[PDB]
Amino acid sequence: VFNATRFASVYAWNRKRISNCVADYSVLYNSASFSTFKCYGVSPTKLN
Amino acid sequence: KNNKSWMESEFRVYSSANNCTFEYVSQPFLMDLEGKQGNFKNLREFVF
């Protein structure tokens, strides 16, 4: 999803529903592969 | 006739599907649909 070939326009932003699987957020938040990252209402550590 | 086939040909289960919130698929296999003569050799019981 983060590396898909193309993304939808800002007005045509796609709404992707994710379920019936597991999420491994260690490789995402802690990899420092992105310029900026912020969370609102909950810290990234607690989300894990 | 010849080339007994015995495999799914037409799909009349449902006409269309638009929104899907869940999906699951099992591993590939082959099940024998060939007709048999005599008594009933198989029994399947399900509880849902």
Curated annotation (Swiss-Prot), chain B:
Domain of life: Viruses
Region (Disordered): 1-18, 27-39
Glycosylation sites: 3, 19
Outcome, altering residue 6 to R: In strain: Omicron/BA.2.75
Subunit and partners: Binds to host ACE2. RBD also interacts with the N-linked glycan on 'Asn-90' of ACE2. Cleavage of S generates a polybasic C-terminal sequence on S1 that binds to host Neuropilin-1 (NRP1) and Neuropilin-2 (NRP2) receptors. Interacts with host integrin alpha-5/beta-1 (ITGA5:ITGB1) and with ACE2 in complex with integrin alpha-5/beta-1 (ITGA5:ITGB1). May interact via cytoplasmic c-terminus with M protein. May interact (via N-terminus) with host bilirubin and biliverdin, thereby preventing antibody binding to the SARS-CoV-2 spike NTD via an allosteric mechanism.
Function: Attaches the virion to the cell membrane by interacting with host receptor, initiating the infection. The major receptor is host ACE2. When S2/S2' has been cleaved, binding to the receptor triggers direct fusion at the cell membrane. When S2/S2' has not been cleaved, binding to the receptor results in internalization of the virus by endocytosis using host TFRC and GRM2 and leading to fusion of the virion membrane with the host endosomal membrane. Alternatively, may use NRP1/NRP2 and integrin as entry receptors.
Protein name: Spike protein S1
Organism: Severe acute respiratory syndrome coronavirus 2 (2019-nCoV)
Name of the coding gene: S
Shown stretch of the complete protein: 147 to 194 of 1273
